[PDB]
């Protein structure tokens, strides 16, 4: 009823959208992993009479439900998708997207990691993102590689029309008291990568984490703090 959709509020398999700004939505779905249930976010950005999708809804059936929810709530076709790192909450559902005619993209680093680990593999490689601080344009967004953080390949996404910073899993929500799933993280480099985000996007008005509630720029410093506390 208007609040940001939450883990116990979304049954696994259902997707909800949340309007962030004009032409910008997040998508929220829930999934089970190792016997616990988690929410996750992605982004939808209007691209004229088409849509750009950022990240799957964490699973094949969730991603099919995402496409149906987009058709119900927005009614414009998803033509392209970018996955922001190689984990299943970002690429699981790429096969569904590809069979729905969506062109799927990720950095070569993400594609290699997904392939090696047995996750679904986006079709098209995004060059120009291999060095920290790199940025490229992709439709209505800028893609930025901040350096290793949650994963070595993690990308962030900025929507310049709306000053929306989608941090993906390199950014945590304010209520987080831990650093999430750090299995593939670089805890030592993560604060440096967050500092690069802060320096590059000082005008961000909304910051969206990979999991949990959006907020403002405070999410960046908070993320550095929780990561340093996990490491220390
Ligand atoms: C698929 C993904 C995965 C699965 C389950 C949970 C998460 C969380 C997570 C947990 C707790 C919080 N809340 S919090 C900050 O603690 O309070 C949060 F926000 C996010 C994250 C994330 O942090 O992005 N991602 C998860 N996977 C799986 C895996 C393990 C590797 C295989 N050995 C691949 O790594 C990974 O990320
Ligand atoms: Zn991850
Ligand atoms: Zn994640």
Strand bridging mode 24-33 / 206-209: unpaired
Beta partners for 37? 32
- Is residue 26 a contact partner of residue 3, using CB atoms and an 8 Å limit? no
Fold held by 7-231: Metallo-beta-lactamase; Chain A (3.60.15)
* Domain layout of the chain by residue ranges: 7-231
By alpha-carbon position, which residue is closest to atom 11 of ligand 1? 180
The finding on whether 177 has its CB within 6 A of some atom of ligand 1 is yes
Rama region for 72: left / alpha / beta (φ>0; ψ in -120 to 50; rest): alpha
- Is residue 174 a contact partner of residue 218, using CB atoms and an 8 Å limit? yes
Give the pair of three-digit tokens for residue 202.
Answer: 């000082």
Active site residues: 85, 87, 89, 150, 181
Which numbered atom of ligand 1 lies nearest the CA of 34? Answer: 5
By alpha-carbon position, which residue is closest to atom 7 of ligand 1? 181
Give the pair of three-digit tokens for residue 26.
Answer: 């997040």
The Cα–Cα gap between 17 and 41 comes to 9
Measured in Å, residue 49 CA sits from the centre of ligand 2 at: 31
> What technique solved it?
X-ray
Give the pair of three-digit tokens for residue 99.
Answer: 């069979």
Residue matched to tokens 């220390």? 232
Please report the resolution in angstroms.
Answer: 1.1
């Amino acid at each position: 009823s208007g609040e940001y959709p939450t883990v116990n509020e979304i049954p696994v398999g259902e997707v909800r959208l949340y309007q962030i700004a004009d032409g910008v939505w997040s998508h929220i779905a829930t999934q089970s992993f190792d016997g616990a249930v988690y929410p996750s976010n992605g982004l939808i950005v209007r691209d004229g009479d088409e849509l750009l999708l950022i990240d799957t809804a964490w699973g094949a059936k969730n991603t099919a439900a995402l496409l149906a929810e987009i058709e119900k709530q927005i009614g414009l076709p998803v033509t392209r998708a970018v996955s922001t790192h190689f984990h299943d909450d970002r690429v699981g559902g790429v096969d569904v997207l590809r069979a729905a005619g969506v062109a799927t993209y990720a950095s070569p680093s993400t594609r290699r990691l997904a392939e090696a680990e047995g996750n679904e593999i986006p079709t098209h490689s995004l060059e120009g993102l291999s060095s920290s601080g790199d940025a490229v344009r992709f439709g209505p967004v800028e893609l930025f590689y901040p350096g290793a953080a949650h994963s070595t390949d993690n990308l962030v996404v900025y929507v310049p029309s709306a000053n929306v910073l989608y941090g993906g899993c390199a950014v945590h929500e304010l209520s987080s008291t831990s650093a999430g799933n750090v299995a593939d993280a670089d805890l030592a480099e993560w604060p440096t990568s967050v500092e690069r985000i802060q320096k590059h996007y000082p005008e961000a008005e909304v910051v969206i984490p990979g999991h949990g509630l959006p907020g403002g720029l405070d999410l960046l410093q908070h993320t550095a703090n929780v990561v340093k506390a996990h490491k220390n």
